[PDB]
């Protein structure tokens, strides 16, 4: 490769084989299915290397070399045609950047730009062009790729563009009318009052406006901007309204002012936390601290709802990511800390696997199927968490198309037009909740990456988390600096791009700003102003820093790799200007308020409807096919393939997740994360979601929304129910018929009544209006309408993180006592066992008692603390069957209930969506428990159902009289298919069925435990005494994400953790011939491309100085080295610097191709491994969290020679205890389930497992009832202490 292209040269560098075996067996079986006779196929990739100077032989073997990667398969010799596939021409792809990253910091400065495209060779050669057009389509995404029939059609991606000049719309010469033609080609979508607006505006300067403004101004202006219809003023049924739908919100705040630090003036919400030890390195010592101080809880919610229903991925991942970026952006700075996913789509009508209720619709051909959104779609999302750090411990799932008798007649009623929710929280400091004020001459920086273009198509959303990481340590830097905090203000990016941003942000502080177009990065030089200022490119933020503090920032970003660049400065006079330093003109010049401009307030004059509804029709319904049925809706089924696919493991401070008990259930009602390293403190995040009543009863289904959020979030120990801070989410289809007066009725019934009833706040919202779709089916009209949408999400500051209850039902004498709070209403309207017999039915759940409802909270608050419940569950999709059959599931044993007290409707009984729950109480307490549920008038709504039993009876009955018998293992299968099946068709097919089949065998006996050694023994103790601190550096690379944890194991170790930046060795500052021991963090160095940890270890091995530093560390004779995730497989790359590892494995990806969130049971082998001392023949469960931690022999002789040569310390093994390589035990699929293995003198020891994450106790998923607040893992830090000296 080295043919002509421009002013460069491109070079065409060969790959490995892309599609994995079973895929290709996939392809091909696809293909048959269109009648296409394709014999043979294979995927190869192939790099492409723009180059603007030349290499030198030892250069062009360091680039072939950074481009060997990924798992060492098979090479084929071409054959075939050849059908290239790159991203489309105009683009710069996530792997593109990160992957360039890597070049330079590697020398290779010649390097202008890296890009990959698959090569597909195709062996079939007797179709019509037309039938290849067909081949052709199913190789690549529409929406993101393209097609190419030779290797060097690639030059076109490269082809370097000439900056566009900006256009003007002539209004002096042309009059109004220019004013429309613009507003329809540049499609601003501005309405009249506001062309009249602009109109003026422009006359009274004298000028025409430029394209730009113009563009930035409809952004300003738009529905989305400024949230029009929740701002203005109702008229229901020819009666006016006294308050806006916000000002309804805005009502909880004023009567439950408590615990809120910031609402409705930031980008999310900010309450008290708690008083605990912030672990983070000082910026002088660079050595990790705790800081006792009060950490704060931050909250916010968004929703990346139609850009998700074009490209799924995208739309996930810069959901999540735009949010995170508010949770940074929040005050003056703030640390994200977990997160909450959630969707909603159509019926997935998965293929061989068509259930009873599912009827296509037809849908848009410009869009995608709920199937693919939900197999995309959650893979995104998962993607930018799991890259830039942050766990996903909580969220919904649910499925929604039926053709509904509703409000307005009878339509078809769901989600084509998907719910893609993306929340979560953060910790922020005290003294920096408040934003700061931007004195005049404020330095104006964008902090982010390069710009391009993205806000048809242009739907079709960029995602590059690695580098918001980048920028979210330097977030971190920033508020670590105490009260030397330079950012005086920030802000995140979003809408409008910069366009909006920027203005928002000097308003914000009374000010203005002159900025320069040319200061601005960008990764696509021929863009225009409009582009460059209107573009809405990912991963960015803006700031102000005072002018003398430039200094401090430059070099913390620098040291982080996180580009930014100062883009204007602060002015006194209200006025926004851009000015052009290469059309040496001005783009932008006008007062402040020209933009922020008004006309008329909206208002929406509306009339009622109330569905009518019949009844629910019993002929196919039979207690136990309703059973069958519900268990097999997405929205009740086994939620593993959402759950898994994202980390929940990382900061360490995970003390509940999805997954609860022996046998990994993902049943967990809320998600709690302990608010640091070293306390038992904490934040709570629940999410309260029931959209389908709304086709019935508006206000029903808001209540039900505050209430499954609150019975979810009860089993928690929180106290005073105003320590619960909500945020509520609209999904609404403004416009359709009655819809409009449901919503302020919906409003209101939570707004003004409610949430103030309870004690509840309101302090962060968003809202999406347009959820409907139309489309042509026929030669008629279809359109798809969601429901009034409300989407609670509960935030509190958990009191004590050690009293959280799970599902997991106990066998010992118990009691199962049911609170219904539906007062025996056993309402059957718009549930689980109506839409799987596709029906609406009659009256809905409601929250029938607001004192009850509180009353229900602190009863459990009273419980929760007093340790007197052994189990909980709350009652929501497919009602207390549902409830019931999950803590069979989550406890793996037997119910013996009796539903005779909850009236003669059996089928009402068991599928009543009403709110309440199931608590499971010791046998001896039963009367207590009564007694106290009594003091709070809840002795009414209190029933006793029964016992569980150890085993595999499901028995529900009624008198003498069995309403349904059941193994309990048949049903953990049935819920469980819609999981398998969604596996089967994303996932190696063979690991879906692996997992599903074992949920089959009864006879498993869960995570146990055994332990060689005193887990409770600090044999680090004696050396803590003496005060002496050993030095350990905690290297972490651009991208690692866990670290701080990592710092804060060796520091109760005994240990001084020193925060070591690769770019703090490659700049010189700091030198390993300090150190006695290193550690390898674990994260998403430069975002896995070019290989996991690769890209990390070449960077090193290829600068001669920092190769011979890190050399001359592993050859001292004192040296200790640790390598967990990530940090694992980047010194599996350095096996030419480290004694004792030639028989080392390759850590490639995982056998069942996909990432693996798990807590796997592993087993302590025998291996020189000093960090592993004394602890060989245990078996204790660990946090597996990778994506690439399959093991790769060779052949069998070097895996046979690696075995005989002991250097084996971690294998995975089945709940038995036997090494097993069968999926997930063994989640990679590593060859007898090795994850870590040593050196001959075990001085250096790698792993996959994180063994910081869970070094606390708390931080365990499940783990045996009696351990202390260490870990069986805490030993390996503590070994390092010992081994020391
Ligand atoms: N309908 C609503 N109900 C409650 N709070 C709201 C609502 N709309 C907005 N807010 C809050 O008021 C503030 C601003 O609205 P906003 O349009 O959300 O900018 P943003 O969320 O900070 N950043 P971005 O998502 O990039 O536009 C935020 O703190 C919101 O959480
Ligand atoms: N989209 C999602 N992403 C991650 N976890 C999810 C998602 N949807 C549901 N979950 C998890 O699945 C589990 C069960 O979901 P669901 O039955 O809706 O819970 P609940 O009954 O509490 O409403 C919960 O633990 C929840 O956090
Ligand atoms: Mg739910
Ligand atoms: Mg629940
Ligand atoms: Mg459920």
Redesign the pocket.
């Known amino acids: 490769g080295l043919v002509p292209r421009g002013s460069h040269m491109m070079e065409i560098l060969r790959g490995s084989p892309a599609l994995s075996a079973f895929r290709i067996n996939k392809l091909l079986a696809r293909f048959q299915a269109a009648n296409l006779q394709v014999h043979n196929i294979y995927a190869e990739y192939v790099h492409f290397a723009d180059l603007n100077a030349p290499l030198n032989d030892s250069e062009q073997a360091q680039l072939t070399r950074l481009l060997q990667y990924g798992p060492a398969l098979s090479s084929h010799t071409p054959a075939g045609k050849l059908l290239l596939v790159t991203p489309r021409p105009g683009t710069i792809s996530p792997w593109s950047s990160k992957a360039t990253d890597i070049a330079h910091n590697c020398g290779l400065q010649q390097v202008d730009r890296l890009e990959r495209g698959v090569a597909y060779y195709i062996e079939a050669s007797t179709l019509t062009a037309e039938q290849w057009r067909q081949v052709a389509a199913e190789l690549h995404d529409r929406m993101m790729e393209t097609v190419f029939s030779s290797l060097t059609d690639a030059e076109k991606l490269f082809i370097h563009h000439q900056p566009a000049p900006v256009s003007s719309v002539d209004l002096l010469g042309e009059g109004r009318q220019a004013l429309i033609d613009a507003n329809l080609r540049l499609g601003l979508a501005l309405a009249e009052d506001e062309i009249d607006y602009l109109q003026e505006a422009f006359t009274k300067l004298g000028r025409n406006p430029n394209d730009i403004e113009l563009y930035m101004f409809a952004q300003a202006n738009s529905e989305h901007?400024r949230?029009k219809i929740?701002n203005a003023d109702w008229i229901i049924d020819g009666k006016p309204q006294p308050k806006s739908?916000?000002k309804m919100?805005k009502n909880t705040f004023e009567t439950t002012p408590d615990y809120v630090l910031s609402?409705?003036?930031?980008?999310?919400?900010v309450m008290e936390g708690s008083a605990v030890g912030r672990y983070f390195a000082d910026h002088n010592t660079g050595r990790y601290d705790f800081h006792q101080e009060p950490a704060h809880i931050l909250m916010?919610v968004?929703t990346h709802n139609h850009p998700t229903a074009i490209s799924p991925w995208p739309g996930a991942a810069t959901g999540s990511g735009?949010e995170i970026?508010?949770e940074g952006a929040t005050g003056r700075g703030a640390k994200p800390k977990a997160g909450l996913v959630g969707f909603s789509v159509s019926n997935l009508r998965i293929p061989g696997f068509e259930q009873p209720w599912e009827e296509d619709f037809g849908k848009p051909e410009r869009i995608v199927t709920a199937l693919d959104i939900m197999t995309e779609g959650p893979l995104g999302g998962a993607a930018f968490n799991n890259e830039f750090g942050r766990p996903a411990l909580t969220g919904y799932f649910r499925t929604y198309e039926e053709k509904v008798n509703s409000h307005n007649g009878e339509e078809l009623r769901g989600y084509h037009k998907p719910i893609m929710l993306a929340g979560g929280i953060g910790n922020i400091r005290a003294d920096h909740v408040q934003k700061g004020e931007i004195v005049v001459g404020a330095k104006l920086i964008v902090l982010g990456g390069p710009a391009m273009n993205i806000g048809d198509f242009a739907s079709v959303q960029r995602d590059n988390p690695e580098m918001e990481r980048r920028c979210q340590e330097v977030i971190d830097r920033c508020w670590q600096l105490g009260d030397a905090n330079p950012i005086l203000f920030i802000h995140?990016?979003?809408?409008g791009g910069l366009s909006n941003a920027m203005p928002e942000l000097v308003s914000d502080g009374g000010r203005g700003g002159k900025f320069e177009l040319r200061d601005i990065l960008s990764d696509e030089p021929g863009m225009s102003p409009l582009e460059i200022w209107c573009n809405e490119s990912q991963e960015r933020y803006v700031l102000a820093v005072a002018a003398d503090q430039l200094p401090l920032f430059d070099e913390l970003c620098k040291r982080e790799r996180a580009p930014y660049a100062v883009i204007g400065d602060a002015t006194e006079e209200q006025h926004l200007s851009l000015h052009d330093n290469h059309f040496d003109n001005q783009p932008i010049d006008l007062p402040l308020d020209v933009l922020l401009g008004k006309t008329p307030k909206m208002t929406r004059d509306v009339q009622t409807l109330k569905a009518k509804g019949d009844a629910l029709n019993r002929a196919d319904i039979t207690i136990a096919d309703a059973v069958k049925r519900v268990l097999h809706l997405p929205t009740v089924a086994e939620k593993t393939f959402l759950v898994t696919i994202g980390d929940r493991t990382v900061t360490g401070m995970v003390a509940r997740d999805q997954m609860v008990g022996p046998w990994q259930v993902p049943v967990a009602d809320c998600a709690v994360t302990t608010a640091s390293l070293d306390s038992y403190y904490g934040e709570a995040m629940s999410i309260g979601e029931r959209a389908p009543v709304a086709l019935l009863d508006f206000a029903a289904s808001a209540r039900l929304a505050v209430g499954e959020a609150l019975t979810n979030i009860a089993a928690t120990q929180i106290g005073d129910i105003k320590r619960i801070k909500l945020s509520?989410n609209?999904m609404a289809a403004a416009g359709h018929p009655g819809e409009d007066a449901g919503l302020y009725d919906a409003v209101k019934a939570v707004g003004e009544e409610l949430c103030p009833q309870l004690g509840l706040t309101?302090?962060?919202?968003?809202?999406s209006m347009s959820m409907k779709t139309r489309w042509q089916e026929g030669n008629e009209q279809r359109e798809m309408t969601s429901p009034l949408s409300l989407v609670i999400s509960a935030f509190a500051r958990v009191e004590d993180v050690r009293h959280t209850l799970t599902p997991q039902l106990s066998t010992e004498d118990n009691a199962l006592l049911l609170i219904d709070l539906g007062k025996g209403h056993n309402a059957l309207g718009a549930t689980a066992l109506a839409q799987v017999y596709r029906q609406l039915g009659d009256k809905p759940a409601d929250v029938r008692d607001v004192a009850q409802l509180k009353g229900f909270y602190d009863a459990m608050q009273a419980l929760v603390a007093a340790r007197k419940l052994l189990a909980w569950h709350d009652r929501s999709d497919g009602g207390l069957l549902v409830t019931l059959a999950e803590m069979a599931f989550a406890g793996h044993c037997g119910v013996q209930v009796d539903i005779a007290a909850l009236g003669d409707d059996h089928l009402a009984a068991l599928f009543n969506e009403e709110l309440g729950g199931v608590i499971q109480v010791r046998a001896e307490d039963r009367d207590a428990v009564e007694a106290l549920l009594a003091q709070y008038g809840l002795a009414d709504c209190v029933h006793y159902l029964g016992q569980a039993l150890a085993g595999d009876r499901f028995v529900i009955t009624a008198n003498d009289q069995t309403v349904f018998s059941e193994s309990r293992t048949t049903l953990r299968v049935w819920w469980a298919e819609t999981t398998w099946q969604m596996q089967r068709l994303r996932d190696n097919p063979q690991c879906a069925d692996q997992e599903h089949e074992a949920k089959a065998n009864d006879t498993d006996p869960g995570l146990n435990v055994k332990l060689s050694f005193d887990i409770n023994e600090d044999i680090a103790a004696p050396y803590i005494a003496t005060g002496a601190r050993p030095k350990v550096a905690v290297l972490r690379e651009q991208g690692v994400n866990s670290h701080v944890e990592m710092a804060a194991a060796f520091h109760r170790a005994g240990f001084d953790a020193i925060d070591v930046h690769m770019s703090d060795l490659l700049g010189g500052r700091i030198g390993l011939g300090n150190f006695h021991a290193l550690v390898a963090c674990g994260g998403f160095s430069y975002g896995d491309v070019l290989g996991a940890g690769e890209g990390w270890a070449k960077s090193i091995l290829f600068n001669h100085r920092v190769r011979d530093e890190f050399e001359t560390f592993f050859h001292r004779p004192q040296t200790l080295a640790l390598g967990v995730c990530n940090g694992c497989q980047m010194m599996s790359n350095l096996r030419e610097l480290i004694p004792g590892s030639e028989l080392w494995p390759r850590f490639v990806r995982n056998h069942s191709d996909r990432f693996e969130a798990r807590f796997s049971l592993v087993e302590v082998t025998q291996s020189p491994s000093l960090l592993l001392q004394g602890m060989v023949g245990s078996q204790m469960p660990i946090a597996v969290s990778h994506g690439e931690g399959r093991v790769e022999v060779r052949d069998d002789a070097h895996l046979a020679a690696l075995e005989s040569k002991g250097l084996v310390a971690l294998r995975y093994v089945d709940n038995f205890g036997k090494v097993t390589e069968t999926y997930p035990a063994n989640p990679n699929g590593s060859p007898n389930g090795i994850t870590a293995v040593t050196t001959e003198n075990g001085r250096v020891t790698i792993m996959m497992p994180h063994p910081e994450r869970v070094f606390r106790t708390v931080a365990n998923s499940w783990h045996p009832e009696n351990w202390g607040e260490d870990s069986p893992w805490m030993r390996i830090f503590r070994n390092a202490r010992k081994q020391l000296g």
Not at 492 to 495: F, L, N, Q
Not at 762 to 767: L, N, S
């Open positions: 901007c949230h929740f739908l916000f919100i609402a409705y003036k930031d980008n999310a919400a916010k968004e735009g970026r508010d995140d990016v979003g809408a509520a609209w309101i302090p962060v919202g968003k809202d």
